[PDB]
Structure 1
Amino acid sequence: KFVIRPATAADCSDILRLIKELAKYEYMEEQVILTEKDLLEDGFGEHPFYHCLVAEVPKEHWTPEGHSIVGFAMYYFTYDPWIGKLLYLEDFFVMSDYRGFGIGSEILKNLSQVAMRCRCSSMHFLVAEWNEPSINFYKRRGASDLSSEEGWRLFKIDKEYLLKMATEE
Structure 2
Amino acid sequence: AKFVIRPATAADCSDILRLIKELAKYEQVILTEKDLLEDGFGEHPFYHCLVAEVPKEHWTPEGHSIVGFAMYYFTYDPWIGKLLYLEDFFVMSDYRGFGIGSEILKNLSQVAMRCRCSSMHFLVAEWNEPSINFYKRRGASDLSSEEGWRLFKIDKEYLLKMAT
Cα RMSD, aligned residues only: 1.0
What's the TM-score once normalised by structure 2's chain length? Answer: 0.96
Distance 2:157 2:36 in 1: 23
Residues in 2 aligned to 1:22 and 1:103: alpha-carbon distance in whole angstroms: 16
In structure 2, list runs of 5 or more residues that go unmatched: none
Pair 1:114 & 2:111 matched: yes
Matched, 1:22 2:19: no
1:105 is displaced (CA, Å) by 1.2
Q: Deviations over 1:112-167 (max 9, x none)?
A: 01100111111000001111111111111111110110111110000001111222
Task: Count residues with an aligned counterpart.
Answer: 163
Within a 5 Å distance, the mapping from 1:11-90 to structure 2 comes to 11-25=12-26, 31-90=28-87
Please state how far the C-alpha of 1:25 moved relative to its aligned partner.
2.0
Distance 2:59 2:109 in 1: 27
Task: Report deviation, 1:23.
Answer: 1.2
Separation in 2, partners of 1:57, 1:152: 40
Q: Tell me the TM-score normalised to structure 1 length.
A: 0.93
SS of 2:25's partner is helix
Separation of aligned partners in 2, 1:23 and 1:138: 20
| Identical aligned residues as a percent | 100
Structure 1 residue runs of 4 or more that deviate by more than 3 Å after TM superposition: none
| Deviation string, structure 1 residues 2-22 (Cα, Å, up to 9, x no partner) | 111100111111000000111
List gaps (5 residues or longer) in structure 1: none
- The aligned residue for residue 5 of structure 1 is 6
Give the C-alpha shift of residue 45 in structure 1: 1.1
Superposition deviation, residue 59 in structure 1 = 2.0
Q: CA deviation at 1:67?
A: 0.7
* 1:140 alignment partner in structure 2: 137
SS of residue in 1 equivalent to 2:62: coil
1:67-107 C-alpha deviation (Å, 9 max, x unpaired): 11000000000001011111000000111111122211111
